[PDB]
Design a protein around this ligand. Sequence first.
Ligand code: GTP
Ligand code: GTP
Ligand code: A1L8X
Ligand code: MG
Ligand code: MG
Lengths: 155, 431, 429
Amino acid sequence: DLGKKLLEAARAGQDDEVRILMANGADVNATDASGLTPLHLAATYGHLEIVEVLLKHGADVNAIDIMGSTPLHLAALIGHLEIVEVLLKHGADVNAVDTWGDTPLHLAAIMGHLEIVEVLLKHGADVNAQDKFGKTAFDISIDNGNEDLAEILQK
Amino acid sequence: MREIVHIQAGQCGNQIGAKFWEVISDEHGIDPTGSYHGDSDLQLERINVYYNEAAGNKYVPRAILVDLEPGTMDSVRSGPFGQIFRPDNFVFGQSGAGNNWAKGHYTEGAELVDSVLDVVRKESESCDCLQGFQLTHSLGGGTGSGMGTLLISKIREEYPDRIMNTFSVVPSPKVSDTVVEPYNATLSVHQLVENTDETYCIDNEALYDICFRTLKLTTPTYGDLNHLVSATMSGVTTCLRFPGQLNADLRKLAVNMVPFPRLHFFMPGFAPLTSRGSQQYRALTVPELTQQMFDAKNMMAACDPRHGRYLTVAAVFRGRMSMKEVDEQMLNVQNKNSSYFVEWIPNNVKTAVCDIPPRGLKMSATFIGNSTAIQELFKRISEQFTAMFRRKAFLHWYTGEGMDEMEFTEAESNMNDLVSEYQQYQDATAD
Amino acid sequence: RECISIHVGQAGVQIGNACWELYCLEHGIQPDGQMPSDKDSFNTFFSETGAGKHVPRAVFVDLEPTVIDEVRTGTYRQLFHPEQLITGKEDAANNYARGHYTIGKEIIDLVLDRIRKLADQCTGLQGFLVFHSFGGGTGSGFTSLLMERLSVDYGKKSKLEFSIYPAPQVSTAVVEPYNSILTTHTTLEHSDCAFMVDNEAIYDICRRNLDIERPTYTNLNRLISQIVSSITASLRFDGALNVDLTEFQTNLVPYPRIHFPLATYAPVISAEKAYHEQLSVAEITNACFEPANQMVKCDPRHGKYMACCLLYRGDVVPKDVNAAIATIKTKRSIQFVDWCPTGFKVGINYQPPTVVPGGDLAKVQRAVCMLSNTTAIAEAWARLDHKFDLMYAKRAFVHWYVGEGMEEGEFSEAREDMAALEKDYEEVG
Ligand SMILES: Nc1nc2c(ncn2[C@@H]2O[C@H](COP(=O)(O)OP(=O)(O)OP(=O)(O)O)[C@@H](O)[C@H]2O)c(=O)[nH]1
Ligand SMILES: Nc1nc2c(ncn2[C@@H]2O[C@H](COP(=O)(O)OP(=O)(O)OP(=O)(O)O)[C@@H](O)[C@H]2O)c(=O)[nH]1
Ligand SMILES: COc1ccc(-c2oc3cc(O)cc(O)c3c(=O)c2OC)cc1O
Ligand SMILES: [Mg+2]
Ligand SMILES: [Mg+2]
């Protein structure tokens, strides 16, 4: 099964291995047991070149795993700015909501990825989006005393 | 109760540890070769707390230097005081831990811990009356955090009636945007809650904020941050290093600052806040020193004390100043801010005064608070921990070291229990 | 009939220093023990060697060496038996439990054996005077351990305390209320008479009578030793009042549990007023009923008297004392319990009081210490008990004691004893 091998090559950052598997029919939209796709894993682990190649060959930019996480959620959580940009250019849903009520904006705010917060805002991130406890990204910045983040979120 | 054994683990631990020894060596008139060139006998009365006396009136730090990463060895030795440390007290591994708590606590770190314990035992056995240990480390890395907490637990086993005190540097995205740091810190706090008697919370979030917003340093460096840390570490150990009517030692500090065993995480603060190589006609009055010491902007943990309540406070004034004026200012702050101090611990703010100011200042004040507001620091780390853990990012780095996924849930639960306990005593009334 | 003084912990040791310094001056004894003047009732407090050296019947004990090392190297380095200056290496860390159980246990047998050496030199040992703080871990915990052991080893001997009652102005630990209640509970049955010394009362007197803005321990201790000396003078000189330890109890303690007399001393005059007009017997006697001159803060007008002794020193004619007393029993609302003689016992020592060079007090021609047992001293217990209650309701700091060989029920047991003591005073009052 070339799907499980593509999932592993995407996570590991094995560019050539990714190219070969797709050339032999590997399912670009294969899922692991939790619903993660090669694009999820390459976005999580920071493999920008594999992200771009997957998006060139039919990857669903907005696929969700079993917890509602999209690739943009994971890129924003881990802090891969260039990958965030590529995903948005290819149609990523800037306001996708996962099973915890989090948007990519929530996750970039929590982890202090301020440059990514700015990019998400510029692409229409919803400042009024509440997680399951009622918190927006701005609420998190106030509760946290993160003055740099709060300034950014008031623009 | 004389000697303290000092341990420094990991990059952060050794870097702030080296600065500590530079700063207090200068205060005690000790030069980089170990000779005493001071002109006051107050400098020598308690020199034995931190230094061993060796051949020919030369003083050697009772300090053990640990790191899985060998390059830290060289950085310390190349420092001004790098040649003062006992060469046999350098205990270093082959490869670092790569920000992996599991490697520090369970694999690489556990392979080296016994060699550290051997040097600790040697330093401990030569002490007249050992009072306990102080450890400098970060919680965001792998060595200082993972191996640091393993060391603590092992020392705990060998020396159960000795106090364990830590200077623990808490991580911040503002200083290191490396996203496994909440994992390492939360796993570490789990350990520190059970195994240390007193912890100074040195928050890189606060240190950055002070440098960037108060000192106007557009791109703070570790040296900018550590300048604040060494001022703090000197201030909070002043009562241990110079004779004082307060009879200060690590156990009395614990007895008077820690009303509940787990709630032993202190918010330190310091005034005046300065940038290095930036003298100013300071000459802070006693009223300015007192107000700044209680100001949220002067805290080394990123918490607003006005959001919680002080269980206990110690305030150490250094320099030549009116004792009466200090007494009046200290009573003022408690009478105005009355609602911020718990009413069920009478006389819970202590004042100490040391004649000798730190280098470069005529007046100085150091704050040690046991404040329920510190829950804001643990809630910040907890929220980042939870954001990562809910998506299970990079968990395989940890379980791949034999670590189990239930230790993550247990650590997160214990730290949230800690937050609930602070809130409990924050809301308690004397009724 | 000899008396042995025992000084425990920093406060006890430093106050003992001041007392014995004053004692030597009062008896004409030099710092090396030599006494030309003569070579007597001072033998109750000083033994005599074959070389004519007069040595205090005194033991100093501390769990760390800092303060006793000062005695070993100071002015009186040669006065005391060197083996009666006893130190461990690690103090009680402000923790009653460490002083009584975990650390104090390591040295208690040495202390008892060294005391036995002094006792064996006595032909009619009366008992012990024990100096110690309430607030320290050694002063509280080791003292109660020592008092427990002394009761077993010297069942017939009297034991008197001078106890330093804590004040926030000069306190050292937040847990001093706990240590105070714990040592009072466990020492109550082993002590026959205890003179509490309220650091806040002494602090106030230094501030307003001696014009010392921020009094040090040295200021406090010189004033305390003056008062202690006026209390023990009857044991060291000829006199008709309080001539042995048993009589202290007979005169000042009607029931064993309410054995805390109040000391009031006058006059306290700044050494800068070296030409002050001399105060009369009537004036210094009236000052004994001003709460501002008391050694413990409380209001005897809110209580009832059970005993009252007036100890005069100096140029004091007995008829003037009687006339001064007569005035007091009239102009004053001074209420005795109905079961006690409404009489005042009077001793007069005709030597003028001594003041130590370096002291803060002016020499005076006449002085007086009144020792009264008044129910109003229960106000001092209530202040302590309330501070205890605030912290104990939350179990604040209790884990430090439970970790050091003590059971948590000892807290409640001690506090119930204090409640019973407060009730003892109410029932008499
Ligand atoms: N304040 C301050 N923080 C530091 C310093 N050095 C590292 N840190 C912080 O410490 C954390 C990283 O831990 P390190 O000490 O570098 O890692 P380690 O203890 O050597 O363990 P390894 O992962 O094996 O390298 C991050 O939060 C850094 O921001 C320092 O010199 N001063
Ligand atoms: N009047 C007076 N009070 C003192 C003196 N020294 C300490 N105190 C008081 O005693 C209490 C502290 O107890 P200490 O006697 O110093 O402590 P300790 O008995 O040595 O016990 P540890 O040090 O805890 O082992 C506080 O209330 C102090 O204010 C003194 O020299 N004179
Ligand atoms: C609630 O009141 C109190 C608060 C603190 C303290 C105290 O503070 C210290 C500060 C230091 O920087 C170093 C110390 O060694 C000590 C210390 O040993 C100590 O206890 C003896 C005592 C109190 O009664
Ligand atoms: Mg490192
Ligand atoms: Mg002591």
